[PDB]
Amino acid sequence: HSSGVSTQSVDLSQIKRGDEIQAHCLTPAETEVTECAGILKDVLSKNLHELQGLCNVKNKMGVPWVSVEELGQEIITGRLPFPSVGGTPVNDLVRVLVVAESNTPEETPEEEFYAYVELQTELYTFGLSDDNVVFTSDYMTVWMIDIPKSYVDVGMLTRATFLEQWPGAKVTVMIPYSSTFTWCGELGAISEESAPQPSLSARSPVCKNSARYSTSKFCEVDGCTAETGMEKMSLLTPFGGPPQQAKMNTCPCYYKYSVSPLPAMDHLILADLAGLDSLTSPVYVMAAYFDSTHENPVRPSSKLYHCALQMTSHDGVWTSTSSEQCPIRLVEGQSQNVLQVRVAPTSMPNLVGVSLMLEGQQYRLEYFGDH
Amino acid sequence: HSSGVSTQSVDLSQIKRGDEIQAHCLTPAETEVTECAGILKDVLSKNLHELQGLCNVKNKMGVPWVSVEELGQEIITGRLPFPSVGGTPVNDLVRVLVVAESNTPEETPEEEFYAYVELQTELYTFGLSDDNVVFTSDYMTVWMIDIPKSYVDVGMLTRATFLEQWPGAKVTVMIPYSSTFTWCGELGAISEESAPQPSLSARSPVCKNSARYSTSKFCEVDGCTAETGMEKMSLLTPFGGPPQQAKMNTCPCYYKYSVSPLPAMDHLILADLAGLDSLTSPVYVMAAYFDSTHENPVRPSSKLYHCALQMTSHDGVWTSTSSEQCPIRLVEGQSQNVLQVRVAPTSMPNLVGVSLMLEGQQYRLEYFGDH
C-alpha cells in the first residue's frame, strides 16, 4: 500500500533510451541540465512513468501531509532508509534524480503544480530548483543534481513543499549505487491525520564495540571457533514480519578486526534468507567495500565501492549474477528455500557492509561503528 | 607536564629550511617521500626536534599504556581534540606529519625502538608504513601522508603500537590548517595504571537546536535584542580552570538561521577572553567558513575555508594579524585585559565555527549541529 519494499529486474534494452538515461541522468557527466533534459523531454513525453523501470529496488513510506497554513504550504518530509553507507568523505559524486508527481484532480485546481524539494544534511541543504529541473509536465517534475556520495546516507532529510495537498502525491529520490543498480526512496503522501507508515527496513551494527573482536581472546564464548564453523547467527526479520526470514552472522567481525591468528576457512556466511520458494521478485544484495590493491602509501585512495548482486527465480530455479570485483557471492544454502551471502575470510577486513533487499524487507548490515 | 595546550609564534625564518619543510613536508606536493626525507635528513640530524618550531599550537593529552600481552604489544590510543571541522568531501588533501619518539636510554636496550602509527576514521584506517617514512633515527621516526581534509576531525582515532613501554614515549600529529597555521596534536604515554589526562579542550555547539533560531519570534525572551547589544554570554572556562575566562555568545545564531528580518548591527561579538594581562604566549582564533559566492546549481560544491588570526603582546602592546577573506576580526574590549572575536552580521550564514586557542585552553565553537 502506502509503504513497503518491492524489487524488479532492470533491462535497459526495454527502457526507451534507458542506456542514455542511466549515463546522462543517473551519472555525473555533463554539468548542465541540457543533455539529460533532452533525453527525458523525448522519452517522458511518450511514457510519463518510464523512470520507474530504472528502479531495481523501490522502498517507500507513507508520510502524512503537514499543513503550514501560516505560509500556505503543504509539506511532506521523511528520512529515507538509505540501504548502504553512502561512501567515504572523498570527492566522489552521485547523480540523483528527484521526481515529484501526483494524480490529476477531478476538478481543475486554481493552484499550479509548484513543488520544491530539498535534501538537507547537518552542514548543508541541497535544494532542487528550476536550474535543477530536467523535465516538467502538469503533474510531474523531475530534478537532477550531483552530491558527494558521503552525504547520501542516514542523516539526509527529504522535504517536499507544495501549495496543495495534491491527491496521490509522491516524491521519489532515485539513487544509483552502481552502474547496474538504482535504489528508489519514495515518500507517499497520506492523510495528515494518519501516523507515518515506514517500510520494514532496518540498520544493524553487527560489530558493536569493535574492540571485543580485536583478538581471538573471546571467540569461544561468542561461539566463533572452527568448531562452531564461525557461525553465530541472529534473526533480522521482526515478529509480525513476512514469512521470509533473514539472519546475520556476527563472527565475520573477527576476520575484520581480530589481530590474533584465526581459523582458516574457504568461505564465511555474512547472512542468509529463508522463504525463497514464496518470493516472486528478485532478491538484491549490495556490498560496500574498500579495494584491497594498495596504491600510493603517501597519498592513499580511500574510495568506497558498491556492488549489487541479484538472485533471480528463472522457471523456479534461483540463479545469481556474479562479479569478480564484488567480494560477495549469492549461493543457495541447503535447499532452494534458502539463500546465503558469502565472502572469503580474506575480504572481511575491507568489507564495510552488506545490504539485503527483497519484497517487503530491507536489512542494512554494518561491520563498523558501535551504534 | 602530561597534558595541556601551548601556543607560540612561528617564523619560517628561524627554522632551518622551514620554507622547504612547509612546502614539501606540510603541503601536498611530490607524492614520493624523497623530497621531504631529504630536507629532514639534513635538518633533523642537526636538531632532532626542529619540527616543534612549526607548531603554532600544541595540544597534548596523557594517555595510559595498554598492554596487548597476547601480541607482545604496548599501545597508546587517543581521540585528539581537533580544533575545527576538517572539511567537506569537496575540500582537497592536507599533508600530515606524524612523529613517534621516546627518550634515548643510557643503557642500550635489547630490541630497537619500534612504532606503528595508524589513523582510523569511522570507515577507513590510514596506516603509516615504511613507505610513509621521511626520517628515522634511534628513537624517532617521522612519517608523511596526504589525507582528504574531511577525515581530519573528531572521530579520527590515533593509535600507536609499540613493543615496549618506552619511557617518554609520545606521538605527535602535525596538522596544517592554512599556509600560516599548524596545529599539533600530541599523545603522551603515561602509566598503565593512570586514567587518561586530556587537555582542557572543549567542543561547544553554540546553536543547539538550530531550528529554534529560525525566526525572531523569541529573540526578546531569549535575551537577544539590539537594545541589549545582541549579547547573551555563557562562560566557557570551567570553575577550576585557569584565571583567563572565556565566554561565547549565542545571539549570533539568529543572524545565521533566522528567516525573519533582524536589527542591523555594526558587528557581533562571537566570543571574548579576559586576563590578557597575565598571558605569556600568543592567542589564536581560527574560523571555518563557506565562500559566499554562489555557483553551479547542478553541482553545488561546498568547500570549507580556514583562516587563523593571531593576537600577540609585544612590550605590553597586544596587536593582531588582520585578514582578508577571514570573516572574523580580533580587537580589544573596553580594557586591554579583554579580547573580543568580532564578525559582521552578514557573515553568520556562512560561518561554520570559530576556535579559540591559548595557553591552557582550547574551545571549539560550532554554529551547526545540536551536538
XYZ file of C-alpha atoms in Angstrom:
742
model
C 0.000 0.000 0.000
C 1.368 3.378 1.089
C 4.547 1.686 2.333
C 6.796 -1.260 1.542
C 9.723 -2.682 -0.397
C 9.499 -4.003 -3.947
C 12.128 -5.328 -6.344
C 12.379 -5.986 -10.080
C 14.802 -6.802 -12.860
C 16.046 -3.842 -14.854
C 16.806 -4.330 -18.553
C 17.844 -1.117 -20.289
C 17.077 -2.917 -23.586
C 13.369 -2.408 -22.959
C 13.501 1.066 -21.415
C 13.450 3.682 -24.192
C 16.887 5.324 -24.329
C 17.446 3.662 -20.969
C 21.168 3.337 -21.536
C 21.274 7.096 -22.149
C 19.172 7.996 -19.156
C 21.407 5.887 -16.898
C 24.506 7.513 -18.416
C 23.447 11.161 -18.546
C 20.710 11.430 -15.934
C 21.940 8.974 -13.262
C 25.681 9.506 -13.743
C 27.721 12.653 -13.102
C 28.647 13.579 -16.690
C 27.506 16.872 -18.268
C 27.292 19.591 -15.612
C 24.326 21.160 -17.390
C 20.697 20.041 -17.329
C 20.653 20.166 -21.157
C 21.680 16.640 -22.164
C 19.532 14.821 -19.598
C 16.622 17.255 -20.145
C 16.756 16.405 -23.841
C 16.546 12.644 -23.310
C 13.649 12.980 -20.860
C 11.699 15.511 -22.939
C 11.591 12.861 -25.654
C 11.255 9.725 -23.521
C 8.867 11.038 -20.828
C 6.646 12.674 -23.464
C 5.958 9.142 -24.686
C 5.733 7.303 -21.360
C 5.393 9.580 -18.340
C 6.312 6.769 -15.944
C 9.322 5.476 -17.853
C 11.746 6.216 -14.997
C 10.080 3.710 -12.669
C 11.540 0.956 -14.827
C 15.045 2.026 -13.811
C 14.412 1.275 -10.104
C 15.868 -2.125 -9.173
C 14.514 -1.582 -5.695
C 11.668 0.655 -4.552
C 11.440 1.441 -0.838
C 8.552 3.621 0.240
C 7.000 5.121 3.318
C 3.649 6.763 3.872
C 4.222 10.300 5.160
C 1.340 12.498 6.428
C 0.762 15.917 4.906
C 1.870 18.736 7.199
C -0.104 21.927 6.583
C 1.904 25.047 7.342
C -1.227 27.224 6.977
C 0.780 30.276 8.031
C 2.840 30.068 4.823
C 0.162 28.328 2.776
C 2.447 25.322 2.366
C 1.679 21.630 2.266
C 4.759 19.662 3.167
C 5.859 16.042 3.144
C 9.168 15.248 4.808
C 10.760 11.932 5.655
C 14.076 10.263 6.398
C 14.662 7.591 3.749
C 16.028 4.278 4.924
C 19.159 4.565 2.755
C 20.250 0.904 2.079
C 24.016 1.199 2.401
C 26.659 3.650 3.659
C 26.946 6.477 1.119
C 30.711 6.496 0.955
C 33.837 7.964 2.478
C 34.111 11.769 2.664
C 36.113 11.880 -0.574
C 35.419 13.825 -3.770
C 33.198 11.247 -5.475
C 29.733 12.287 -6.619
C 26.438 10.521 -7.211
C 23.887 11.969 -9.620
C 20.477 11.839 -8.005
C 17.227 12.121 -9.883
C 14.307 13.544 -7.932
C 10.734 13.063 -9.147
C 7.632 14.768 -7.747
C 4.201 13.711 -9.021
C 0.511 13.301 -8.198
C -2.822 12.348 -9.706
C -4.726 14.834 -11.842
C -7.581 16.333 -9.743
C -11.148 15.728 -10.935
C -11.859 19.441 -10.602
C -9.314 21.713 -12.332
C -7.408 23.355 -9.428
C -6.637 27.046 -9.011
C -3.047 26.463 -7.911
C -0.348 25.368 -10.348
C 1.680 22.245 -9.577
C 4.535 24.146 -7.862
C 6.923 21.922 -5.950
C 10.229 22.475 -4.227
C 12.350 19.624 -2.911
C 15.388 19.826 -0.700
C 17.831 17.323 0.739
C 19.420 18.608 3.895
C 22.481 17.465 5.754
C 23.510 18.917 9.126
C 26.056 21.089 7.336
C 24.365 21.940 4.002
C 20.926 21.841 2.375
C 20.788 20.775 -1.283
C 17.852 22.458 -2.961
C 16.249 21.239 -6.170
C 15.381 24.475 -8.022
C 14.359 25.449 -11.570
C 18.020 25.247 -12.527
C 17.893 21.578 -11.479
C 14.717 20.782 -13.458
C 15.279 18.380 -16.370
C 11.602 17.653 -17.152
C 8.285 19.268 -16.328
C 4.624 18.499 -17.009
C 1.222 19.296 -15.473
C 1.641 16.951 -12.505
C 5.244 15.734 -12.664
C 8.558 17.485 -12.113
C 11.992 15.892 -12.362
C 15.151 17.480 -10.980
C 18.756 16.388 -11.337
C 21.731 17.125 -9.057
C 25.232 15.921 -8.152
C 26.022 15.397 -4.478
C 29.084 13.936 -2.754
C 28.279 10.300 -2.055
C 29.046 10.581 1.660
C 26.066 12.902 2.106
C 23.550 10.484 0.590
C 23.069 8.471 3.729
C 21.237 8.266 7.015
C 21.209 11.861 8.177
C 19.769 13.248 4.956
C 16.247 14.571 5.250
C 13.986 14.908 2.186
C 11.478 17.779 2.278
C 8.934 18.375 -0.460
C 6.989 21.634 -0.417
C 3.747 22.097 -2.346
C 0.922 24.636 -2.309
C -1.782 21.966 -2.293
C -2.301 18.511 -0.814
C -2.332 17.007 -4.301
C -4.051 13.578 -4.489
C -1.603 10.697 -4.720
C 1.419 12.942 -4.304
C 4.750 11.189 -4.008
C 8.384 12.145 -4.101
C 10.985 9.688 -5.269
C 14.725 10.042 -4.900
C 16.448 7.810 -7.460
C 19.832 6.797 -6.112
C 22.250 4.844 -8.293
C 24.763 2.959 -6.144
C 26.310 1.339 -9.192
C 26.174 1.295 -12.966
C 23.648 -1.540 -12.813
C 21.808 -0.790 -9.585
C 19.441 2.063 -8.750
C 17.607 2.308 -5.409
C 14.439 4.410 -5.239
C 13.350 6.014 -1.978
C 9.750 7.079 -2.140
C 7.670 9.319 0.081
C 3.992 8.761 -0.496
C 1.744 11.470 0.870
C -1.028 10.246 3.140
C -3.821 11.918 5.136
C -2.420 14.477 7.554
C -4.324 12.669 10.305
C -2.518 9.348 9.769
C 0.607 8.131 11.523
C 3.784 7.671 9.442
C 3.948 4.318 7.612
C 7.659 3.407 7.458
C 8.729 0.358 5.466
C 10.182 -2.734 7.092
C 13.762 -1.502 6.837
C 16.485 -1.968 9.460
C 20.039 -0.910 10.108
C 22.161 -3.300 12.139
C 25.640 -2.543 13.574
C 26.944 -6.117 13.613
C 30.373 -5.412 15.150
C 29.143 -3.276 18.064
C 32.208 -2.390 20.141
C 34.823 -3.293 17.524
C 37.327 -3.848 20.345
C 35.871 -7.140 21.558
C 36.776 -8.657 18.189
C 40.302 -7.255 18.292
C 41.551 -10.650 19.486
C 40.683 -14.347 19.312
C 40.517 -13.850 23.081
C 36.718 -14.246 23.218
C 35.978 -16.411 20.162
C 34.943 -19.409 22.265
C 32.241 -17.610 24.268
C 30.879 -15.682 21.280
C 30.663 -19.037 19.555
C 33.197 -18.139 16.882
C 35.513 -21.146 16.743
C 36.377 -23.584 13.955
C 34.031 -25.889 15.877
C 31.045 -23.553 15.576
C 32.147 -23.015 11.995
C 32.324 -19.317 12.853
C 28.535 -19.067 12.734
C 26.730 -17.052 15.389
C 23.508 -16.230 13.526
C 20.818 -13.896 14.864
C 17.354 -13.189 13.422
C 16.876 -9.934 11.496
C 13.233 -10.284 10.461
C 10.910 -8.807 13.128
C 7.951 -10.627 14.661
C 4.846 -9.744 12.666
C 7.094 -9.654 9.625
C 6.623 -11.568 6.334
C 7.343 -15.337 6.197
C 10.817 -14.997 4.677
C 13.354 -14.813 7.494
C 16.782 -13.211 7.309
C 19.723 -13.726 9.653
C 23.095 -12.061 10.184
C 26.390 -13.605 11.295
C 28.485 -11.861 13.949
C 31.669 -13.933 13.606
C 32.830 -12.198 10.433
C 33.663 -9.316 12.762
C 36.743 -11.243 13.911
C 38.113 -11.753 10.397
C 37.800 -7.997 10.011
C 39.372 -6.897 13.297
C 40.984 -9.733 15.283
C 44.729 -9.190 15.433
C 45.218 -12.670 16.883
C 45.524 -15.620 14.465
C 42.197 -17.141 13.409
C 40.856 -20.445 11.979
C 41.143 -20.629 8.188
C 38.069 -21.321 6.024
C 37.035 -21.349 2.350
C 34.097 -19.005 2.924
C 32.054 -17.184 5.559
C 28.290 -16.664 5.662
C 27.551 -12.975 6.195
C 23.810 -13.655 6.259
C 21.083 -15.932 4.884
C 17.496 -15.667 3.639
C 14.764 -18.285 4.028
C 11.486 -18.457 2.120
C 12.803 -18.175 -1.432
C 10.045 -20.551 -2.536
C 7.363 -17.917 -1.906
C 9.163 -14.872 -3.332
C 8.063 -13.568 -6.709
C 10.527 -10.738 -7.343
C 14.347 -10.902 -7.436
C 16.412 -10.590 -4.265
C 19.109 -7.944 -4.140
C 22.252 -7.949 -2.023
C 24.571 -4.955 -2.090
C 28.004 -4.646 -0.553
C 30.130 -1.675 0.405
C 33.858 -2.410 0.462
C 37.291 -0.908 0.016
C 39.603 -2.114 -2.730
C 42.478 -4.106 -1.256
C 45.010 -3.344 -4.004
C 47.305 -0.842 -2.341
C 48.405 2.272 -4.169
C 50.445 5.317 -3.241
C 51.166 4.953 0.502
C 51.869 8.690 0.639
C 48.540 9.674 -0.930
C 46.198 6.725 -0.206
C 42.967 6.446 -2.144
C 40.055 5.651 0.206
C 37.207 5.303 -2.272
C 34.334 3.103 -1.041
C 32.891 0.735 -3.627
C 29.402 -0.684 -4.023
C 28.347 -3.761 -5.947
C 24.908 -5.285 -6.072
C 24.328 -8.956 -6.831
C 20.905 -10.156 -7.968
C 19.425 -13.598 -7.222
C 16.569 -14.385 -9.624
C 13.898 -17.078 -9.990
C 14.080 -18.478 -13.531
C 11.419 -21.131 -14.174
C 11.585 -21.919 -10.458
C 15.343 -22.233 -10.002
C 17.136 -19.370 -8.244
C 20.273 -18.122 -10.006
C 22.530 -15.208 -9.018
C 24.557 -12.710 -11.039
C 28.310 -12.941 -10.323
C 31.070 -10.359 -10.293
C 34.873 -10.503 -9.962
C 35.479 -7.256 -8.056
C 32.430 -7.896 -5.845
C 33.726 -9.609 -2.670
C 30.400 -11.350 -2.012
C 28.619 -14.303 -3.571
C 24.977 -15.333 -3.543
C 24.558 -19.108 -3.362
C 21.644 -21.120 -2.035
C 22.044 -22.908 1.280
C 20.920 -26.478 1.836
C 17.795 -26.153 -0.324
C 16.312 -23.602 -2.717
C 14.202 -22.059 0.028
C 17.420 -20.643 1.480
C 19.835 -18.014 0.136
C 23.282 -17.281 1.594
C 25.597 -14.288 1.396
C 29.213 -15.437 1.253
C 32.645 -13.845 1.339
C 36.242 -15.048 1.506
C 37.502 -14.568 5.090
C 40.266 -12.561 3.441
C 37.826 -9.824 2.395
C 36.275 -9.037 5.789
C 38.992 -6.557 6.784
C 37.920 -4.482 3.767
C 34.191 -5.143 3.932
C 32.131 -2.218 5.242
C 28.711 -3.840 4.984
C 26.114 -5.821 3.062
C 22.505 -4.945 2.459
C 19.644 -7.338 1.876
C 16.694 -6.146 -0.193
C 13.628 -8.199 -1.057
C 9.867 -7.954 -1.261
C 8.624 -6.397 1.987
C 12.032 -6.214 3.707
C 15.365 -4.406 3.743
C 18.284 -5.052 6.068
C 21.418 -2.940 6.213
C 24.207 -4.853 7.990
C 27.232 -2.831 9.035
C 30.572 -4.235 10.181
C 31.681 -0.873 11.551
C 30.554 1.637 14.154
C 29.236 0.904 17.639
C 25.665 2.100 17.083
C 53.552 18.048 32.008
C 51.455 15.127 30.739
C 48.785 17.313 29.142
C 47.955 20.883 28.193
C 47.664 23.460 25.437
C 50.534 25.747 24.443
C 50.922 28.417 21.775
C 53.766 30.242 20.037
C 54.603 32.401 17.057
C 56.025 30.672 14.011
C 58.542 32.353 11.709
C 59.872 30.146 8.923
C 62.980 32.349 9.178
C 64.242 30.947 12.484
C 63.601 27.395 11.337
C 66.410 25.762 9.378
C 64.953 25.308 5.900
C 61.456 25.971 7.240
C 60.133 27.111 3.878
C 61.240 23.862 2.242
C 59.808 21.817 5.104
C 56.428 23.511 4.930
C 56.426 23.433 1.129
C 57.468 19.787 0.864
C 56.529 18.042 4.106
C 53.458 20.002 5.219
C 51.891 20.709 1.822
C 50.570 18.119 -0.634
C 53.130 18.090 -3.447
C 55.501 15.343 -4.663
C 53.815 12.024 -3.858
C 57.175 10.463 -3.015
C 58.910 10.706 0.363
C 62.123 11.597 -1.482
C 61.882 15.399 -1.463
C 60.705 15.667 2.158
C 63.026 12.980 3.566
C 65.940 14.839 2.030
C 65.122 18.037 3.873
C 64.508 16.273 7.187
C 67.596 14.034 6.863
C 69.638 17.234 6.832
C 67.639 19.394 9.262
C 66.594 16.804 11.872
C 70.039 15.204 12.161
C 71.209 18.609 13.349
C 68.225 19.280 15.615
C 66.130 16.161 16.147
C 63.202 18.257 17.453
C 63.209 21.039 14.860
C 59.615 20.337 13.762
C 58.226 21.555 17.120
C 59.015 25.092 15.965
C 56.401 24.782 13.244
C 53.600 24.173 15.767
C 51.624 27.406 16.253
C 49.548 25.494 18.792
C 50.367 22.253 20.624
C 47.577 20.295 22.311
C 48.595 17.218 24.271
C 46.898 14.549 26.315
C 48.336 11.984 28.684
C 47.256 8.506 27.652
C 47.859 5.197 29.542
C 49.838 2.325 28.077
C 47.514 -0.525 27.111
C 49.132 -3.963 27.117
C 48.352 -6.485 24.402
C 50.404 -9.202 26.043
C 48.849 -11.615 23.512
C 50.766 -9.970 20.702
C 53.548 -8.693 22.923
C 52.464 -5.137 22.219
C 52.219 -1.914 24.220
C 49.740 0.531 22.736
C 48.515 4.075 23.263
C 45.413 5.490 21.589
C 43.658 8.821 21.781
C 40.973 10.976 20.207
C 42.759 14.282 19.566
C 40.587 17.364 20.149
C 40.841 18.566 16.549
C 40.322 22.394 16.732
C 37.897 22.738 13.844
C 35.777 20.932 11.272
C 38.306 19.403 8.851
C 36.426 19.885 5.589
C 33.725 18.701 3.189
C 34.154 15.910 0.588
C 34.873 18.773 -1.823
C 37.999 20.009 0.022
C 41.452 18.950 -1.148
C 44.083 16.983 0.774
C 46.168 18.016 3.760
C 49.732 16.736 4.160
C 50.212 15.470 7.684
C 53.429 14.710 9.531
C 53.306 12.097 12.280
C 56.115 11.820 14.842
C 56.684 8.837 17.153
C 59.525 9.048 19.672
C 60.873 8.232 23.137
C 63.686 9.170 25.494
C 67.031 7.687 24.486
C 68.139 5.394 27.349
C 71.769 5.369 28.514
C 71.834 1.576 28.505
C 71.362 0.074 25.036
C 68.103 -1.937 25.052
C 67.550 -5.466 23.769
C 65.217 -4.538 20.913
C 65.186 -1.445 18.711
C 62.721 1.417 19.076
C 59.717 0.362 17.010
C 56.392 2.093 16.471
C 53.484 1.641 14.087
C 51.021 4.531 13.912
C 47.620 4.461 12.279
C 44.812 6.997 11.990
C 41.475 5.231 11.923
C 38.417 7.146 10.893
C 34.884 5.790 11.057
C 35.259 3.627 7.918
C 38.892 3.722 6.801
C 42.176 3.313 8.672
C 45.236 5.108 7.306
C 48.354 3.182 8.271
C 51.741 4.889 8.472
C 54.047 2.308 6.891
C 57.742 2.250 5.998
C 56.654 3.702 2.662
C 55.490 6.765 4.602
C 58.780 7.228 6.410
C 60.521 10.551 5.764
C 63.001 10.409 8.667
C 64.324 7.804 11.062
C 66.754 7.778 13.992
C 67.424 5.576 17.021
C 64.426 6.907 18.908
C 62.356 8.924 16.474
C 60.541 8.170 13.254
C 58.712 10.761 11.172
C 56.012 9.819 8.664
C 54.230 11.839 5.988
C 50.881 11.222 4.277
C 48.196 13.110 2.304
C 44.624 12.758 3.541
C 41.420 14.454 2.406
C 40.768 17.209 4.953
C 37.299 15.793 5.608
C 38.792 12.876 7.563
C 40.806 15.095 9.889
C 38.203 15.770 12.544
C 36.722 14.455 15.777
C 36.173 10.755 15.233
C 39.681 10.167 13.944
C 41.398 7.890 16.420
C 45.215 7.931 16.677
C 46.718 4.534 17.569
C 50.438 3.918 18.174
C 51.674 0.347 18.628
C 54.996 -0.250 20.389
C 56.706 -3.430 21.610
C 57.880 -1.953 24.918
C 56.576 0.813 27.197
C 59.442 3.116 26.217
C 59.998 5.956 28.723
C 58.923 9.350 27.387
C 57.071 7.731 24.505
C 54.906 10.195 22.607
C 53.178 10.568 19.263
C 52.538 13.893 17.558
C 50.322 14.675 14.583
C 51.080 17.960 12.830
C 48.109 19.412 11.006
C 48.407 22.386 8.661
C 45.054 24.214 8.540
C 46.464 27.003 6.382
C 49.788 28.160 4.963
C 50.394 30.095 8.170
C 48.811 27.887 10.848
C 49.743 24.439 12.051
C 48.108 22.614 14.946
C 49.909 19.753 16.669
C 48.008 17.031 18.467
C 50.119 15.109 20.936
C 49.674 11.869 22.814
C 51.996 11.460 25.769
C 52.207 7.947 27.173
C 51.610 7.695 30.907
C 51.436 4.919 33.496
C 49.385 1.867 32.562
C 47.611 2.435 35.903
C 46.617 6.041 35.272
C 43.367 7.397 33.908
C 43.788 9.423 30.696
C 44.663 13.089 31.165
C 43.008 15.081 28.379
C 43.837 18.774 27.996
C 41.258 21.476 28.690
C 39.822 21.303 25.163
C 36.084 21.567 24.593
C 33.716 21.432 21.642
C 30.655 23.626 22.148
C 27.501 23.601 19.967
C 26.655 27.290 20.252
C 23.382 26.945 18.364
C 21.980 23.772 19.977
C 18.648 23.116 18.246
C 19.394 25.376 15.278
C 15.745 25.320 14.245
C 14.921 27.469 17.307
C 16.803 30.365 15.681
C 14.572 30.078 12.615
C 12.695 33.332 13.276
C 12.761 36.377 15.545
C 9.588 35.477 17.443
C 11.526 34.691 20.623
C 14.585 36.950 20.295
C 13.350 39.116 23.154
C 12.533 36.437 25.756
C 15.800 34.730 24.783
C 17.755 37.861 25.700
C 18.971 38.717 22.205
C 17.940 42.255 21.325
C 19.597 45.198 19.574
C 18.789 47.094 22.775
C 20.931 44.647 24.742
C 23.569 44.560 22.013
C 22.758 41.033 20.839
C 24.807 39.646 23.691
C 23.994 36.590 25.746
C 27.312 35.340 27.100
C 27.920 31.954 28.701
C 31.193 31.030 30.441
C 33.362 28.564 28.514
C 36.136 28.354 31.097
C 35.292 25.735 33.787
C 35.212 26.536 37.531
C 38.601 25.066 38.419
C 40.138 26.307 35.195
C 42.921 28.885 34.563
C 42.366 32.535 35.514
C 41.760 33.628 31.893
C 37.976 33.312 31.485
C 36.493 32.749 28.031
C 32.854 33.259 27.006
C 30.735 32.519 23.916
C 27.734 34.464 22.580
C 24.579 32.663 21.401
C 22.763 35.604 19.790
C 24.780 35.249 16.548
C 22.772 32.072 15.857
C 19.740 34.178 14.847
C 21.855 36.039 12.342
C 22.887 32.669 10.927
C 19.477 30.946 10.715
C 16.608 33.443 11.155
C 14.333 33.801 8.124
C 12.730 36.828 9.761
C 14.457 40.203 9.461
C 16.797 41.207 12.292
C 18.131 44.543 13.622
C 21.130 45.914 11.751
C 24.281 45.759 13.880
C 27.718 47.244 13.190
C 29.172 43.950 14.360
C 28.523 40.917 16.542
C 30.747 39.515 19.272
C 31.226 35.772 18.891
C 33.366 35.313 21.960
C 35.656 37.121 24.373
C 38.643 36.373 26.560
C 39.614 38.161 29.796
C 43.014 38.108 31.506
C 45.238 39.106 28.579
C 47.485 40.892 31.064
C 48.537 37.572 32.615
C 49.117 35.740 29.331
C 52.658 34.863 28.229
C 52.094 33.434 24.738
C 50.031 34.363 21.669
C 46.291 33.778 21.366
C 44.991 32.094 18.244
C 41.488 32.232 16.823
C 40.608 30.162 13.783
C 37.422 30.420 11.758
C 35.867 27.803 9.481
C 33.526 29.224 6.878
C 31.993 28.836 3.442
C 32.713 31.060 0.466
C 29.725 33.378 -0.014
C 29.968 33.321 -3.807
C 27.298 31.117 -5.388
C 27.917 28.613 -8.136
C 26.741 25.710 -10.304
C 23.210 24.704 -9.159
C 23.563 21.277 -10.775
C 26.687 20.567 -8.682
C 26.822 22.799 -5.547
C 30.415 22.409 -4.359
C 30.543 23.337 -0.679
C 34.279 23.827 0.025
C 35.209 24.808 3.609
C 37.761 27.551 4.295
C 40.036 28.110 7.314
C 41.752 31.285 8.460
C 43.603 31.680 11.736
C 44.164 35.053 13.383
C 46.878 35.700 15.959
C 46.817 38.113 18.877
C 50.216 38.781 20.443
C 51.725 41.096 23.039
C 54.892 42.998 22.189
C 56.228 45.037 25.125
C 52.786 45.323 26.690
C 51.072 46.039 23.356
C 48.598 43.432 22.073
C 48.453 43.517 18.270
C 46.575 41.208 15.903
C 47.169 39.959 12.384
C 44.298 41.113 10.192
C 42.939 39.060 7.318
C 41.093 39.363 4.015
C 38.515 36.730 3.307
C 38.720 35.938 7.019
C 35.221 36.797 8.252
C 36.480 37.339 11.779
C 38.435 40.120 13.439
C 40.314 40.298 16.747
C 40.041 43.524 18.767
C 40.440 44.574 22.405
C 37.464 45.169 24.650
C 36.942 48.115 26.986
C 40.285 47.298 28.632
C 43.449 45.737 27.190
C 42.781 42.881 29.598
C 39.936 41.716 27.324
C 39.999 40.386 23.768
C 36.881 40.052 21.604
C 36.207 37.996 18.485
C 34.045 40.048 16.109
C 32.130 39.354 12.905
C 29.774 41.187 10.538
C 26.137 40.053 10.950
C 26.227 39.378 7.220
C 28.770 36.563 7.578
C 26.898 34.418 10.086
C 25.017 32.406 7.469
C 28.345 31.076 6.064
C 30.140 30.760 9.410
C 30.654 27.118 10.423
C 32.788 27.654 13.521
C 35.468 29.599 15.388
C 38.165 28.083 17.601
C 39.895 29.844 20.490
C 43.338 28.512 21.399
C 45.539 29.915 24.125
C 47.826 28.764 26.931
C 45.999 26.023 28.815
C 42.669 26.352 26.981
C 41.120 25.413 23.642
C 37.459 25.977 22.758
C 35.968 24.763 19.502
C 32.794 26.767 18.828
C 30.340 25.235 16.346
C 27.430 27.101 14.779
C 25.829 23.923 13.397
C 24.818 20.607 14.943
C 22.789 20.370 18.146
C 25.506 18.012 19.371
